Design a protein around this ligand. Sequence first.
Ligand SMILES: O=c1ccn([C@@H]2O[C@H](COP(=O)(O)OP(=O)(O)O)[C@@H](O)[C@H]2O)c(=O)[nH]1
Length: 385
Amino acid sequence: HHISMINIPAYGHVNPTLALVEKLCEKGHRVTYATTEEFAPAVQQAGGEALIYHTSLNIDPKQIREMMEKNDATLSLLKESLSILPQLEELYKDDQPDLIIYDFVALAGKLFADKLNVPVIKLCSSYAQNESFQLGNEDMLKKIKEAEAEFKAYLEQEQLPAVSFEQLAVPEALNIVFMPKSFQIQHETFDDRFCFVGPSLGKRTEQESLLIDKGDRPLMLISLGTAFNAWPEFYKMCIDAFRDSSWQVIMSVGKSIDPESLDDTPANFTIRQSVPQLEVLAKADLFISHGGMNSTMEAMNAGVPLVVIPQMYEQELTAKRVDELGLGVYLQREEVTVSKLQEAVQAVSGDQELLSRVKSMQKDVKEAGGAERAAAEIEAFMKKS
Ligand SMILES: O=c1ccn([C@@H]2O[C@H](COP(=O)(O)OP(=O)(O)O)[C@@H](O)[C@H]2O)c(=O)[nH]1
């Protein structure tokens, strides 16, 4: 059976799938992955055949911080669906797939699946959505009124057979979500076509030899993820906040920034562009994180409290949520100072009550499926559909 995974080129939107791809293959299913070259090694390691599309999205964190002019930045994902559909058509012309699985922003995978009337499962790598819970601000539901400005540029080259924008908000037969249903916002509103398996961890690209036995001293991880990590000011404040302190600190600065471009690295710090986050959290006593869903779930999967410094709306939702569920503290940026970094690491470390809350989220996130349940919910959907 040929399963075709369609996704954007983004670590946070593609890493959960890797563990999934490893399982489907272990079940004797050919899995093809429509990605760029940046991800073909990760996809190839899981067992997928990478099939490449030349892409229109930004990958380098520098390019994501600039092109923050916000001229309908949401449209990017639409235009990208319209660049990617033609190339998916060609990639699979004589390799039609039995099952298309597409990430919630890879609309190209929806259109492509419609156009071939092939079964389609939707992976939600962030919060899922439905008729009740539409995620987004006042200003981000009033931006899908400028999504319609481009939707009247849909009749400038081709046409829609009828209404086709209420069919991108609408969920599919099976919608796998990579958090536990408790952590989903408006959980109760989500019916049985949503399947909340929590974090989908497995093997990752071999990162550098970062052995870190630490000692009888506590270990803190610092990372703003893989896209909104282009903030030199923050990485200096962390060095100022925790140099030569109780804490052993491992800080990922992303690909936007030189570990030599900073102040000289304290004896207690390790500083890299990239760390093996799953390995570090196996030893971390605290994680200063940006509230990426992968990071938030990888933390809870390791029993690791959270200081959440969100960069984007999606991330502020996850940041409020972590506070509301008392799984750590919400520290806003443009409120982030060296004193405030210290106050929060203080307030979260040695709150035994808070630590017990994430120790039970550790259970609650593993009690959900994982990649195994998702691969079961997938194959079962294959037999049925
Ligand atoms: O130094 C790093 C930084 C990030 N990641 C991985 O990148 C993903 C980040 O996804 P998330 O949704 O947290 O944030 P995003 O990167 O999408 O902004 C997670 O799976 C991390 O395990 C990693 O492995 N090492």
